[PDB]
Design an enzyme around this catalytic site. Structure first.
Site, short mmCIF file in Angstrom:
data_model
loop_
_atom_site.label_atom_id
_atom_site.label_comp_id
_atom_site.label_asym_id
_atom_site.label_seq_id
_atom_site.Cartn_x
_atom_site.Cartn_y
_atom_site.Cartn_z
CG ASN A 103 92.19 16.41 3.46
OD1 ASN A 103 91.23 16.28 4.21
ND2 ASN A 103 93.04 17.42 3.58
CG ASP B 20 96.01 18.36 1.78
OD1 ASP B 20 96.66 19.22 1.09
OD2 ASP B 20 95.04 18.66 2.49
CE1 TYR C 273 95.64 18.62 5.80
CE2 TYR C 273 95.83 18.54 8.19
CZ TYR C 273 95.26 19.08 7.05
OH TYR C 273 94.37 20.12 7.16
CG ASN D 289 97.66 22.24 2.92
OD1 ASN D 289 96.67 22.81 2.44
ND2 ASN D 289 97.64 21.59 4.08
CG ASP E 99 87.14 20.00 2.37
OD1 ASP E 99 87.82 18.95 2.54
OD2 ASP E 99 87.31 21.04 3.03
CG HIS E 100 90.84 17.43 -0.04
ND1 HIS E 100 92.10 17.71 -0.55
CD2 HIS E 100 90.62 18.24 1.04
CE1 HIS E 100 92.57 18.71 0.18
NE2 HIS E 100 91.71 19.08 1.14
CG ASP F 263 86.88 18.35 6.17
OD1 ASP F 263 87.78 19.02 6.76
OD2 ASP F 263 85.68 18.73 6.09
CD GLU G 119 91.47 18.52 7.99
OE1 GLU G 119 91.58 19.58 8.65
OE2 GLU G 119 90.77 18.42 6.97
CG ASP H 26 94.74 15.96 -2.05
OD1 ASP H 26 95.12 15.59 -0.92
OD2 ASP H 26 93.80 16.79 -2.23
MG LIG Z 1 89.76 19.84 6.11
#
Ligand SMILES: [Mg+2]
Length: 275
Positions: free
Chosen positions: A25, A167, A128, A169, A265-266, A27, A53, A240
């Site tokens: 991911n 991802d 995602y 979530n 951030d992943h 971002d 993303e 993930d």
């Molecule tokens: Mg993000």
């Protein structure tokens, strides 16, 4: 708190890994490129790279991507008119037999969340999954997504062994996040999302590759909020995954969490299969 063990590059039967899949991911594709995301991809050298993303339309892609040596077959999905939101990409060394988009349900196919890439011996899905949102306002929708996505994947796995990455979530169990207690009413750790994930594993059926290999390993996370120094303190979540059809478990070499790769951030995750 966590050191990902060395890469196990042979199956339990001793067959060397022949396929390396990487999921990340990012971002935002351009934000990731500036934070040296591509440089890492070049060192990792996967056969297949799944990005989540991307926040990028297919007509506004960074020129640096098509250049990627060994990942020349590229497929992208984004929300049609909605820039800077969601978006997934699948980049492959080898050409898939067929690439499709979405999960075959109009309500769930508007946010560029899924790419299906069929290969000779398996089908690869990258996703995602929709976040349950701030204050859980999108949780009822998320539960409808969960049901349609489980049904779609069950249909795919009936035709060919399946690899699902991305991802998702949701942190499945308490071991999957640093603070399970403080997060039971937050997106990613609600009982509804956890139950949906358990049902996905049982109904398809699919196995969590990392957890199959490392069932009691704690502190193994793939996401840390940019806020409150979470990544330095390892206050993370394992959002993930690589989920595999049971017939692919004898081909499983290793499922890695590349904790130290910066760019998002992943962190990336890597799968090694002996296909
Ligand atoms: Mg993000």
């Amino acid at each position: 708190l966590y050191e990902d063990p060395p890469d196990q590059k042979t199956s339990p039967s001793g067959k060397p890994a022949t396929l390396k899949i990487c999921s990340w991911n990012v971002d935002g594709l351009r934000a990731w490129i500036k934070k040296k995301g591509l440089d890492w991809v070049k060192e990792e050298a996967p056969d297949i790279l799944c990005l989540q993303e991307t926040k990028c339309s297919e007509n506004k892609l960074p020129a640096e991507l098509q250049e990627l040596p060994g990942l020349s077959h590229q497929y992208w999905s984004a929300p049609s008119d909605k820039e800077g939101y969601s978006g997934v990409g699948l980049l492959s060394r080898q050409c898939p037999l067929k690439v499709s988009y979405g999960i075959g349900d109009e309500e769930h196919d508007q946010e560029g969340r899924v790419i299906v890439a069929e290969f000779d011996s398996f089908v690869l899905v990258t996703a995602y999954v929709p976040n349950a949102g701030r204050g859980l306002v999108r949780l009822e929708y998320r539960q409808r997504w969960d049901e349609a996505f489980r049904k779609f994947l069950k249909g795919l796995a009936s035709r060919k062994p399946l690899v699902l990455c991305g991802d998702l979530n949701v942190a499945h169990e308490e071991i999957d996040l640093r603070n399970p207690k403080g997060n039971k009413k937050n997106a990613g750790f609600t009982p509804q999302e956890r139950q949906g994930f358990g049902e996905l594993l049982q109904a398809v059926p699919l196995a969590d590759s990392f957890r199959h290999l490392y069932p009691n390993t704690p502190y193994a996370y793939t996401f840390w909020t940019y806020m409150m120094n979470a990544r330095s303190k390892n206050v993370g979540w394992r959002l993930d995954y690589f989920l595999l059809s049971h017939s692919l478990l004898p081909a499983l070499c290793d499922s890695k969490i590349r904790s130290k790769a910066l760019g998002s951030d992943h962190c990336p995750i890597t799968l090694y299969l002996a296909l």
